[PDB]
């Protein structure tokens, strides 16, 4: 199956006093494995998954050094972008960065990507070919021209197509007991009387991994969206995820309705019926 390694960075300027708050997190698929918090006491990149603790002190030195350099770059960028947008020094502003790479079912490079944002809006994004940037406005246009004219412009592409893939493969092998294990959803249906003539059927999917899942209601074999409710997928806290979908049906007609569950861990989709 497909796999991904992604890094998320958030820098929030702190007018009034001090340096911006900087938080970085690293994911392999839906598993967080590293973090960095400027407000934490260690001032080190920290493990958040057991399989990354196998790495020696040289890895943690390298990751701490590079993540600190990234934080400094984002702090500089916060001041530069404040100047770009003619904003006052009194307000707080936020820069967000996500980049990563995907390997396909063939365990070879499939995709690379990087997106940068300012104050919750698109700023600049790498194109699919990894050879040029897309700028949302004129300030980002300035950044785009500077980056594309630079001698070291190629470095990010070389990272996404190469180094990123090699580290992802290494992480997948080291943490294969969990990273390459799919947890199929544990499903059940509940029934709640809403009135003398109507009832609510709720289809539960619990403790599944990865997060991607599709829950659908069908009436007599036809997809139904009316009179349904669908909560956002949420984390259980133990690394797995939860979701449910509900439908309001006439009392006595519950057998007409089926809940259909699609997930990576199911060889065939599940069908639940009351």
């Amino acid at each position: 199956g497909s796999h991904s390694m992604r890094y998320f960075f958030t820098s929030v300027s702190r007018p009034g006093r001090g340096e911006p708050r900087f938080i970085a997190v690293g994911y392999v698929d839906d598993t967080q494995f590293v973090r960095f918090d400027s407000d934490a006491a260690s001032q080190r990149m920290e493990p958040r998954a057991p399989w990354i603790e196998q790495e020696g002190p040289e890895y943690w030195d390298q990751e701490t050094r590079n993540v600190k350099a990234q934080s400094q770059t984002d702090r500089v960028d916060l001041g530069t972008l404040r100047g770009y947008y003619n904003q006052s020094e009194a307000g707080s502003h936020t820069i967000q960065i996500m980049y990563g790479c995907d390997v396909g079912s063939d365990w070879r490079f499939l995709r690379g990507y990087r997106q940068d944002a300012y104050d919750g809006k698109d700023y600049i994004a790498l194109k699919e070919d990894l050879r040029s940037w897309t700028a949302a406005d004129m300030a980002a246009q300035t950044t785009k021209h500077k980056w594309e004219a630079a001698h070291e412009a190629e470095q990010l592409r070389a990272y996404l197509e190469g180094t990123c893939v090699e580290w992802l493969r290494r992480y997948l092998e080291n943490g294969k007991e969990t990273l390459q294990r799919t947890d199929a959803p544990k499903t059940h249906m509940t029934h709640h009387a809403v009135s003398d003539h109507e009832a609510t059927l709720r289809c539960w999917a619990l403790s599944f991994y990865p997060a991607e899942i599709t829950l659908t209601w069908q009436r007599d074999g036809e997809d139904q969206t009316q009179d349904t409710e669908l909560v956002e997928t949420r984390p259980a806290g133990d690394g797995t995820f939860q979701k449910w979908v509900a439908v309001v049906v006439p009392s006595g007609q519950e057998q007409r309705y089926t809940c259909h569950v699609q997930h990576e861990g199911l060889p065939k989709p599940l069908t639940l019926r009351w």
Partner: peptide, 9 residues
């Protein structure tokens, strides 16, 4: 491992 050559905006 993270990217180590981000350029300033």
């Amino acid at each position: 491992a993270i990217f180590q050559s981000s350029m300033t905006k």
